[PDB]
Design a binder for this molecule. Structure first.
Ligand SMILES: [Mg+2]
Ligand SMILES: [Mg+2]
Ligand SMILES: [Mg+2]
Ligand SMILES: [Mg+2]
Length: 52
RNA sequence: GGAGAUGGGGAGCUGUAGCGAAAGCGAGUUUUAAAAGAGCGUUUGUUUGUUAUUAUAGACCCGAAACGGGUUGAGCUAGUC
């Protein structure tokens, strides 16, 4: 793809960088993405609730 | 590594060949003198997430008369001095 550089002033570079096709995948998986987000949200739990 | 996602870590676990108590043999094996007959095999995996059931824990909640171990009581009362 056309991934292009950014300078400090906010103007764009005139030379875009080509991208190897291995990065972009023609097949997208959404269920593994959902499970990854859920396990990231989990393990953030302190779990210090206690009752007698 | 942030009380992280994760990376390293292949120790192991399931499946890949089964049969027999076993030595053993092996797409065959056990029984038997038998190769016949019969039994079992000659294929469909694994790791997670969710739900249902189940096993160990008190295991849906409330309820005994009880049992065992320790301490406190003879200012009431019973006896004795
Ligand atoms: Mg790990
Ligand atoms: Mg046969
Ligand atoms: Mg599968
Ligand atoms: Mg008295």
């Amino acid at each position: 793809a056309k991934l292009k550089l950014i300078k400090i002033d906010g103007s764009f570079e005139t030379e875009p960088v080509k991208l190897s096709p291995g990065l972009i995948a023609k097949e997208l998986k959404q269920q593994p993405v959902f499970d990854a987000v859920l396990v990231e949200q989990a393990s953030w739990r302190q779990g210090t609730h206690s009752i007698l």
